[PDB]
């Protein structure tokens, strides 16, 4: 490939699963729940993964959050009946599984950098046909999955090149490349801080000690926002190290930050899988499905 990480070890995960009592689910869900597709409105879950989440969420031992870029509109329509946790814009709103409510974490942010990335995103899609901009409440997207292969990657790599050097001098704004788009979105807000805010918390406790703390994450993703989860899940295991915590009978802390992506992805997840079909064989395992 050649390979960066291992293939995941689902029966360690499922017989891990099955020895713990506090379990936390951290799903990305584009290109990780569910496939990549050309119309991100089609991005719509499978019965196969509502069953999954159905299942899982039924016990009590359980709590599951989907961490996701998308906004808060589609989480809502997609998950919101389900018994799960949302975030939307890349760690922008949460809404915990009882609230009635979202929580923005960046509505003290400064947000005038707005109109001057939509105003770059203008430029760049006006030069790129079959693009285009996707406003969302605070994260600004720009799309070029639909354009011609090598203009688009061109005019991406330009863009990201001057949104880098004004936006992101002038204000403390990240400029993500995704899978064939650029995200812009407050530094001080990503999936690394709700992560964090959900695993160093009482399990399973709304948002405002080891026998509280989750014994089990899981956490799935495949684009570079999601690395954000990975590294944050990677700092926590080793401040339980740093830390002499004692261990479960697998040597660990239960702690397994997965990518969704071939055997040769760069990311520091300890382990991959392929697709979103092998994501929910993995979950469906854990469920006791298939
Ligand atoms: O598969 C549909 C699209 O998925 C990605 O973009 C969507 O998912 C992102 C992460 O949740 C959001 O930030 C974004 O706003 C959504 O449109 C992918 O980047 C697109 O290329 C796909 O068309
Ligand atoms: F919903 Be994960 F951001 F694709
Ligand atoms: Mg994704």
């Known amino acids: 490939s050649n390979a960066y990480t291992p293939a995941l070890n689902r029966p360690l995960l499922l017989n891990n699963y099955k020895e713990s009592q506090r379990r936390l689910f951290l799903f990305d869900y584009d290109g990780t729940l569910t496939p990549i597709v050309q119309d991100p409105a089609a991005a719509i879950p499978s019965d196969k993964l509502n069953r999954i989440l159905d299942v899982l969420s039924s016990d009590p031992k359980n709590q599951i959050w989907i961490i996701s870029g998308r906004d808060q509109a589609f989480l809502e329509k997609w998950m919101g009946n389900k ?4 975030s939307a814009e890349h760690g922008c709103f949460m809404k915990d599984i009882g609230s009635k409510e979202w929580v923005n974490l960046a509505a003290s942010f400064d947000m005038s950098w707005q109109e001057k990335v939509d105003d770059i995103f ?9 693009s285009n901009i996707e406003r969302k409440k605070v994260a600004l997207t720009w799309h070029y999955r639909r354009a011609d292969p090598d203009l688009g990657n061109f005019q ?3 863009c990201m090149k001057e949104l880098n050097d004004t936006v992101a001098k002038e204000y403390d704004v990240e400029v993500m490349a995704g899978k064939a ?29 080891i026998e509280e703390l989750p014994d ?4 799935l993703g495949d684009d570079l926002t999601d690395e954000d989860m990975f590294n944050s899940l990677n700092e926590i295991n080793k401040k339980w190290k740093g830390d002499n915590r004692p261990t479960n009978k697998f040597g660990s802390y239960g702690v397994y930050p997965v990518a969704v992506g071939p055997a040769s992805k760069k990311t520091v997840a300890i382990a991959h899988l392929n697709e979103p079909r092998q994501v ?4 469906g395992l854990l469920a006791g499905l298939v």
């Open 181 to 209: 788009n650029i995200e812009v979105r407050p530094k001080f807000v990503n999936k690394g801080e709700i992560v964090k805010r959900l695993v160093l918390h009482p399990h399973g406790a709304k948002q405002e000690p």
């Open 156 to 158: 991406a790599e330009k």
């Open 83 to 86: 018994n799960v946790g949302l």
């Open 216 to 219: 089990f994450m899981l956490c």
């Open 122 to 130: 203008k430029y760049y899609t006006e030069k790129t046909p079959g």
């Open 280 to 283: 929910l064989e993995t979950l």
